[PDB]
Each structure stands twice: as C-alpha cells, then as structure tokens.
Amino acid sequence: XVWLTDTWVLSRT
Amino acid sequence: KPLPALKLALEYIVPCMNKHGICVVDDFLGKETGQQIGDEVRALHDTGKFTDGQDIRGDKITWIEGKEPGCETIGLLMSSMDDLIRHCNGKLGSYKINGRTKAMVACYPGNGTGYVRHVDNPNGDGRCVTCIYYLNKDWDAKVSGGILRIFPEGKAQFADIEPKFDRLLFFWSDRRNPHEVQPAYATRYAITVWYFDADERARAKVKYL
Ligand SMILES: O=C(O)CCC(=O)C(=O)O
Ligand SMILES: [Mn+2]
C-alpha cells in the first residue's frame, strides 16, 4: 500500500 | 485486497504521472485474469493472426477491438484501462482525453528482436498517453532481456521497465519519453492502447491516405 514517491512503481496488491 | 480502481487512479496514477511522466502498476488484474489474457494472446499468435510491426522494430502485431470471439479477457483489460483513464477525471496534465486506439497486441519473437529508440507521437497526432499491459509469466530480464528503457527529458538517468507479468504501464506519448525495447531473447508479449487528447487529434496534423 506504499508508494515511494521518488519512484514510479506500486503494486496494486 | 487489490486497491479499488478509483483510489488507484486518484491517489497514485494521477500524482505519479504528473510528477514523473511514467507510472507502473504491478499486479494490475491478478494471476487468473493475467494468465487468461496470456492464453488469448498465445492463441492469436498460434493461429497465425499477427503481421509484421515494421531495421527499426522486430515485433509482430495484431489489432484487437475487444469484442472478437476468443478475445473476451483482452476486452476486459481494455475496459479496465478505460475505467482508470475515466477515474483520472481530466487530472492527467491538461489533456482532455476522449478517444483511444484499438489494442495493439505485440510479440517480440526472441532472437534479439527489439524496437530502436523512438518517440511514440513526435508529430502532434493526438496521442497523449501510452498504456501498456505485460503478460510474460516469470519474465526475467537477466535471462531474456526485453527491457523497455525510457529516457525522460530533463532527467540524466533512464528508467528501465521490465515487461513483467500483470504489469500495467502509463507514460506520456510525446517527446518527453523517447524509449527503446532492448533485445528480447524469449517470446515477449504486450498489449498497448494509446489515449487521445480531443483537441490535438482534431487538429489533424497527420492525414492517412
Ligand atoms: O513493448 C514495449 O515495452 C513498448 C513497445 C513500443 O515502444 C511500441 O510499440 O511503440
Ligand atoms: Mn513506443
């Protein structure tokens, strides 16, 4: 549920 | 529990695209739907439906509207992409997104095939967002290559996107994002839709004879 905002990847699960 | 589409769009896709111009959502549809889409794509390939995508590009492609028999799950993927764009509610840049292409189902058939560095829409043809879904179970660029390398303008570092199973990718289609498909050494599949800005598209900078 965590977005590292300097990156552009997030898992939806 | 997968994040709901509305929340995924408003709380991640929109801010990520406006900050970086590239946005990856992993585990977009889950294993069952992803494998179903893979089966549909492999069926299209196996029955000879692809043609040359072309020196510049070594992919084989076919265009899918979404309602064709045997492409039901691809149609579900396309409607899910559409839902996400709708939920973005005009917050992607200043674009007014009102149309899109059919789905381009593409295969790089190993053997070092790729796509040289290019910009998707360099001539103002209306396409503002590129949306790609990858369906390669257990893909590992260490073995099979096939990385999509994006070279965002104004940044010194490049962005490497592995064509991972169940991965959805957005990026601005204009000159901000030159990119290449690095040589692929296994069968690499992906499905692309491009979304149109209504005004740019209506300017008809490209006439197709
Ligand atoms: O498959 C990919 O990662 C990108 C393909 C691409 O650049 C294209 O078809 O324009
Ligand atoms: Mn491209």
Side-chain angles (χ1 to χ4, degrees), chain A, chain B residues 2-6 8-30 32-54 56-136 138-154 156 158-163 165-209:
Chain A
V2 178
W3 174 31
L4 298 182
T5 60
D6 278 0
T7 77
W8 40 87
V9 178
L10 176 67
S11 167
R12 191 186 183 168
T13 62
Chain B
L3 275 165
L6 182 58
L8 178 67
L10 292 176
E11 295 310 324
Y12 174 59
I13 297 168
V14 164
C16 188
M17 283 294 286
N18 288 325
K19 177 171 192 62
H20 297 299
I22 299 165
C23 174
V24 173
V25 178
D26 277 320
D27 309 295
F28 178 43
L29 295 168
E32 285 57 45
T33 296
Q35 289 179 327
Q36 204 164 349
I37 293 166
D39 289 335
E40 293 185 3
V41 169
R42 280 180 293 270
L44 294 168
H45 196 203
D46 286 343
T47 58
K49 300 309 190 61
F50 293 169
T51 65
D52 281 5
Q54 177 70 76
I56 183 180
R57 61 192 287 181
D59 57 338
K60 314 299 187 181
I61 66 185
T62 195
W63 292 93
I64 294 303
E65 190 274 334
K67 298 174 187 52
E68 299 93 336
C71 302
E72 292 82 10
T73 322
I74 293 166
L76 173 53
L77 165 71
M78 301 167 74
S79 80
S80 306
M81 293 174 166
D82 286 351
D83 291 342
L84 287 176
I85 291 295
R86 184 171 40 84
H87 289 330
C88 288
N89 194 58
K91 295 161 180 170
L92 290 175
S94 63
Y95 296 119
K96 182 181 319 165
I97 297 177
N98 80 330
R100 62 157 166 79
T101 61
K102 298 185 188 174
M104 186 186 79
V105 177
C107 172
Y108 292 87
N111 285 317
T113 54
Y115 199 150
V116 304
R117 184 178 169 149
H118 66 284
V119 166
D120 278 354
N121 171 25
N123 302 313
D125 74 13
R127 291 179 289 157
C128 62
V129 173
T130 305
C131 180
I132 310 188
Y133 182 74
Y134 299 105
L135 57 138
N136 304 295
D138 298 314
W139 188 276
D140 180 5
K142 291 205 286 299
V143 175
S144 300
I147 286 171
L148 171 67
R149 175 164 294 173
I150 312 176
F151 305 93
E153 268 194 341
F158 54 70
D160 284 350
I161 312 292
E162 283 199 46
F165 171 81
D166 204 24
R167 170 171 278 194
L168 187 71
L169 165 69
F170 302 87
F171 59 89
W172 303 134
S173 315
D174 73 11
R175 63 163 274 120
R176 285 175 284 186
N177 287 313
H179 55 280
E180 66 187 22
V181 179
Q182 300 192 336
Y185 299 111
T187 313
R188 177 200 193 278
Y189 295 120
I191 298 171
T192 301
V193 165
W194 285 272
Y195 287 92
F196 286 100
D197 180 63
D199 295 322
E200 185 186 331
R201 195 187 194 181
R203 298 198 279 276
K205 294 283 201 170
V206 186
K207 191 177 179 180
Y208 307 83
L209 277 78

